[PDB]
Every structure is written in structure tokens, then in C-alpha cells.
Enzyme design. Structure first.
Site, PDB file in Angstrom:
ATOM      1  N   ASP B  25       0.822  -1.248   0.000  1.00 55.70           N
ATOM      2  CA  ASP B  25       0.000   0.000   0.000  1.00 55.70           C
ATOM      3  C   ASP B  25       0.845   1.284   0.000  1.00 55.70           C
ATOM      4  O   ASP B  25       1.269   1.804   1.055  1.00 55.70           O
ATOM      5  CB  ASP B  25      -0.956   0.003   1.210  1.00 55.70           C
ATOM      6  CG  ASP B  25      -1.945   1.139   1.168  1.00 55.70           C
ATOM      7  OD1 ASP B  25      -1.877   1.953   0.214  1.00 55.70           O
ATOM      8  OD2 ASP B  25      -2.809   1.190   2.095  1.00 55.70           O
ATOM      9  N   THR B  26       1.100   1.854  -1.208  1.00 56.46           N
ATOM     10  CA  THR B  26       1.894   3.068  -1.343  1.00 56.46           C
ATOM     11  C   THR B  26       1.215   4.305  -0.751  1.00 56.46           C
ATOM     12  O   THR B  26       1.895   5.329  -0.471  1.00 56.46           O
ATOM     13  CB  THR B  26       2.279   3.348  -2.811  1.00 56.46           C
ATOM     14  OG1 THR B  26       1.076   3.525  -3.618  1.00 56.46           O
ATOM     15  CG2 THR B  26       3.119   2.254  -3.434  1.00 56.46           C
ATOM     16  N   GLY B  27      -0.106   4.286  -0.568  1.00 54.36           N
ATOM     17  CA  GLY B  27      -0.830   5.370   0.057  1.00 54.36           C
ATOM     18  C   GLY B  27      -0.847   5.381   1.563  1.00 54.36           C
ATOM     19  O   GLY B  27      -1.361   6.359   2.175  1.00 54.36           O
TER      20      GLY B  27
HETATM   21  C1  LIG Z   1      -3.560   2.526   6.707  1.00 51.60           C
HETATM   22  C2  LIG Z   1      -3.352   3.929   7.271  1.00 51.60           C
HETATM   23  C3  LIG Z   1      -1.908   4.025   7.790  1.00 51.60           C
HETATM   24  C4  LIG Z   1      -4.422   4.213   8.326  1.00 51.60           C
HETATM   25  N1  LIG Z   1      -3.450   4.902   6.167  1.00 51.60           N
HETATM   26  C5  LIG Z   1      -4.544   5.135   5.437  1.00 51.60           C
HETATM   27  O1  LIG Z   1      -5.660   4.636   5.619  1.00 51.60           O
HETATM   28  C6  LIG Z   1      -4.442   6.177   4.325  1.00 51.60           C
HETATM   29  C7  LIG Z   1      -5.166   7.416   4.842  1.00 51.60           C
HETATM   30  C8  LIG Z   1      -5.052   8.596   3.881  1.00 51.60           C
HETATM   31  C9  LIG Z   1      -5.785   9.853   4.361  1.00 51.60           C
HETATM   32  C10 LIG Z   1      -7.312   9.560   4.397  1.00 51.60           C
HETATM   33  C11 LIG Z   1      -7.699   9.339   2.933  1.00 51.60           C
HETATM   34  C12 LIG Z   1      -7.058   7.961   2.570  1.00 51.60           C
HETATM   35  C13 LIG Z   1      -5.530   8.164   2.494  1.00 51.60           C
HETATM   36  C14 LIG Z   1      -4.834   6.885   2.036  1.00 51.60           C
HETATM   37  N2  LIG Z   1      -4.977   5.770   3.026  1.00 51.60           N
HETATM   38  C15 LIG Z   1      -4.356   4.579   2.465  1.00 51.60           C
HETATM   39  C16 LIG Z   1      -5.270   3.826   1.510  1.00 51.60           C
HETATM   40  O2  LIG Z   1      -4.474   3.050   0.574  1.00 51.60           O
HETATM   41  C17 LIG Z   1      -6.370   2.995   2.187  1.00 51.60           C
HETATM   42  C18 LIG Z   1      -5.853   1.752   2.906  1.00 51.60           C
HETATM   43  C19 LIG Z   1      -6.860   0.667   3.246  1.00 51.60           C
HETATM   44  C20 LIG Z   1      -7.059  -0.400   2.377  1.00 51.60           C
HETATM   45  C21 LIG Z   1      -7.994  -1.405   2.652  1.00 51.60           C
HETATM   46  C22 LIG Z   1      -8.744  -1.320   3.832  1.00 51.60           C
HETATM   47  C23 LIG Z   1      -8.478  -0.305   4.739  1.00 51.60           C
HETATM   48  C24 LIG Z   1      -7.561   0.699   4.438  1.00 51.60           C
HETATM   49  N3  LIG Z   1      -7.382   2.641   1.183  1.00 51.60           N
HETATM   50  C25 LIG Z   1      -8.682   2.973   1.329  1.00 51.60           C
HETATM   51  O3  LIG Z   1      -9.160   3.581   2.307  1.00 51.60           O
HETATM   52  C26 LIG Z   1      -9.548   2.473   0.137  1.00 51.60           C
HETATM   53  C27 LIG Z   1     -10.559   3.533  -0.287  1.00 51.60           C
HETATM   54  C28 LIG Z   1     -11.333   3.094  -1.546  1.00 51.60           C
HETATM   55  N4  LIG Z   1     -12.607   2.807  -1.375  1.00 51.60           N
HETATM   56  O4  LIG Z   1     -10.766   2.996  -2.618  1.00 51.60           O
HETATM   57  N5  LIG Z   1     -10.264   1.234   0.539  1.00 51.60           N
HETATM   58  C29 LIG Z   1     -10.248   0.123  -0.194  1.00 51.60           C
HETATM   59  O5  LIG Z   1      -9.808   0.161  -1.384  1.00 51.60           O
HETATM   60  C30 LIG Z   1     -10.869  -1.090   0.531  1.00 51.60           C
HETATM   61  C31 LIG Z   1     -10.681  -2.390   0.114  1.00 51.60           C
HETATM   62  C32 LIG Z   1     -11.224  -3.471   0.839  1.00 51.60           C
HETATM   63  C33 LIG Z   1     -12.043  -3.193   1.934  1.00 51.60           C
HETATM   64  C34 LIG Z   1     -12.616  -4.266   2.646  1.00 51.60           C
HETATM   65  C35 LIG Z   1     -13.469  -3.971   3.685  1.00 51.60           C
HETATM   66  C36 LIG Z   1     -13.606  -2.657   4.102  1.00 51.60           C
HETATM   67  C37 LIG Z   1     -13.075  -1.595   3.409  1.00 51.60           C
HETATM   68  C38 LIG Z   1     -12.229  -1.861   2.311  1.00 51.60           C
HETATM   69  N6  LIG Z   1     -11.661  -0.869   1.623  1.00 51.60           N
END
Ligand SMILES: CC(C)(C)NC(=O)[C@@H]1C[C@@H]2CCCC[C@@H]2CN1C[C@@H](O)[C@H](Cc1ccccc1)NC(=O)[C@H](CC(N)=O)NC(=O)c1ccc2ccccc2n1
Lengths: 99, 99
Positions: B25-27
């Protein structure tokens, strides 16, 4: 180009006639852009992340330029702190992860 | 290897001696793993993402194997919906984005 991961991988995008900064995000299924007044029809959607869900507007067949590379697809608009480019558009510009 | 993005970039990890599946996860700034028993000392922390903020246990200097590559660094444990490998460990295994 090659982007290292010491810092957030932020690049310039063009959408709806405006320049913005956005995050290249391999962990995101979808592309999520900060609140902006895009024209035309949209459908209600809820999307989840760490933390829970938010309400967004789904716009189809939107033109977006990413670091100079053209793409077209679905963009979700709503209250995010960061503009995120997800896999639906990363594939269109030929992006890979390498190690 | 070179990993394309038409599917989620899921790999096998080993943590505390146990095999799990996790998302590259690059984000993500940090690495967040689902609730588990883990050998080591921890302290309470809070972190956020798309739907808000959650409580986690912060473990420093943890040995973790990611797709066959070794890292030793900080792991957050808590009620995350998906196991995520963020930039703090992606940099240790030499990962870059390319297009
Ligand atoms: C992991 C943590 C260190 C908390 N960082 C982050 O969460 C940062 C926060 C940043 C500021 C807020 C806006 C998002 C950015 C990028 N994110 C990273 C970012 O890569 C984040 C990581 C992630 C993946 C999967 C499940 C949970 C969390 N992705 C997401 O939040 C994307 C949003 C989307 N709908 O496309 N979620 C998903 O693509 C995704 C996939 C599977 C799932 C299964 C069940 C529940 C939820 C699920 N969400």
C-alpha cells in the site's frame, strides 16, 4: 518515471479544468477527489476505509491527466483530506510496483 | 518482482512466526495488522484514514518477512479491516513505483 517511497508519492493532476495534487495509491480500489463542482449526472455511493464509511458522488467517464498521462474512468467526489488515485486509473497509465 | 495493478497487490507475510495475507500500500504511511497475539512490548496510539480514527497497539523493532524479503520496524495492531504494508516497510524492501 520512477518514484521512491521515502515521502508520500504526490503528483500533479488535471480534472474539470483545475490543477490539483494527488497521491498514487496501490492500496485503493477507487479514485477519490476532494469536494469540487463537477458538471452532470451522478449516483449516490458509500465507500469504506480504515475508520469506517463516507458518502460520495459517483461520476462516470471523467477525463483526468496524471503526471502528464491521459486517463478516463470513474471518479468519486466527497469529503477526503487527500486526493487519491486508485487502481482503476493506475492501470491506465501503465503503473507497476517493483522490488 | 514486477507487480501489475489489475487485481489487489496481495502477498504472504510472516509475523510472530505466523503466515498471513497483506496488501502492498503506497498510500499508507504506516503498517497496520489485524488483532493478534504478538511477542514484544507495546504502547497505545491513534491513527486515521478514510472514515476516521481508531485505537491501535504500537510495537517497535518487529521482525517481518514480506514476499520473501526481510524488514525490522514498527507494526501497529488493531481493528483494521485489511492487513496493510505501508511506506515505513516498503522502503526497507526497496520498493518503487514505475510508469
Ligand atoms: C492505513 C493507514 C496508515 C491508516 N493509512 C490510510 O488509511 C491512508 C489514509 C489517507 C488519508 C485519508 C484518505 C485515505 C488516504 C490513504 N490511506 C491509504 C489507503 O491506501 C487505504 C488503505 C486501506 C485499504 C484497505 C482497507 C483499509 C484501508 N485505502 C482505502 O481507504 C480504500 C478507499 C477506496 N474505497 O478505494 N479502501 C479500499 O480500497 C478497501 C478495500 C477493501 C475493503 C474491505 C473492507 C472494508 C473496506 C475496504 N476498503
Amino acid at each position: 518515471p520512477q518514484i521512491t517511497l521515502w515521502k508520500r508519492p504526490l503528483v500533479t493532476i488535471k480534472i474539470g479544468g483545475q490543477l490539483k495534487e494527488a497521491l498514487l495509491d496501490t492500496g485503493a480500489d477507487d479514485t477519490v477527489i476532494e469536494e469540487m463542482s463537477l458538471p452532470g449526472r451522478w449516483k449516490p455511493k458509500m465507500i469504506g476505509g480504515i475508520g469506517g464509511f463516507i458518502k460520495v458522488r459517483q461520476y462516470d467517464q471523467i477525463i483526468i491527466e496524471i503526471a502528464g498521462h491521459k486517463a478516463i474512468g470513474t471518479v468519486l467526489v466527497g469529503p477526503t483530506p487527500v486526493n487519491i488515485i486508485g487502481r482503476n486509473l493506475l492501470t491506465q497509465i501503465g503503473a507497476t510496483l517493483n522490488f
